[PDB]
Structure 1
Amino acid sequence: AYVITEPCIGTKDASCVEVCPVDCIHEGEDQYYIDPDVCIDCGACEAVCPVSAIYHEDFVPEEWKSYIQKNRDFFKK
């Protein structure tokens, strides 16, 4: 699944939320998040996101797997 990290923080809007075939981009405190368990590993968002700030959950550094687990948290519990 393609999940948030860090470079998106407070950086612009749009060009991700509108593209997703399963609408699973939702809001966080500052930046948006993505439910990774819903995300069907389609990419797309990948291509439009500047420098792919949306990174695949295991390309995502262990440090930022915290955020993946956060995006999960948000929509699980």
Structure 2
Amino acid sequence: AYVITEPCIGTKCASCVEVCPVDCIHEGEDQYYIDPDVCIDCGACEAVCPVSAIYHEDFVPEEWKSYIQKNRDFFKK
């Protein structure tokens, strides 16, 4: 499962939408948030993101693992 981080935050980007097999990218407001728990781990959204920042949750540095929790949380409750 891959998740967004910091470099994605470019005021309502929307490239990662529609292409995802199960469209598990969501607006909080600022960006499109991937649900790691719905993401079936696939080489689309990251390749589409013109920054290369949608990394595996474990790959995302601890500082930014906060986002993995947020991305989890958003849709869990």
TM-score (norm 2): 0.88
Question: 5+ unaligned residues in a row in structure 1: which ranges?
Answer: none
Moved more, 11-20 or 25-34: 11-20
After TM superposition, give the deviation of residue 23 of structure 1 in Å.
0.8
Figure out how many residues of one structure are paired with residues of the other and give that number: 77
Moved more, 46-55 or 64-73: 46-55
How many Å separate the matches in 1 of 2:74 and 2:35? 8
8 Å contact from structure 1 (residues 2, 43) kept in 2: no
Moved more, 23-32 or 35-44: 23-32
Question: 5+ unaligned residues in a row in structure 2: which ranges?
Answer: none
After TM superposition, give the deviation of residue 21 of structure 1 in Å.
0.2
How many Å separate the matches in 1 of 2:50 and 2:59? 16
8 Å contact from structure 1 (residues 7, 53) kept in 2: yes
Task: State the 4+ residue runs in structure 1 displaced beyond 3 angstroms.
Answer: none
Identity %: 99
TM-score (norm 1): 0.88
- What do you get for the CA RMSD once the two structures are aligned? 1.4
Q: Give CA-to-partner distance per residue, 1:2-38, whole Å, 9 cap, x none.
A: 1110111125622211210011000123122110011
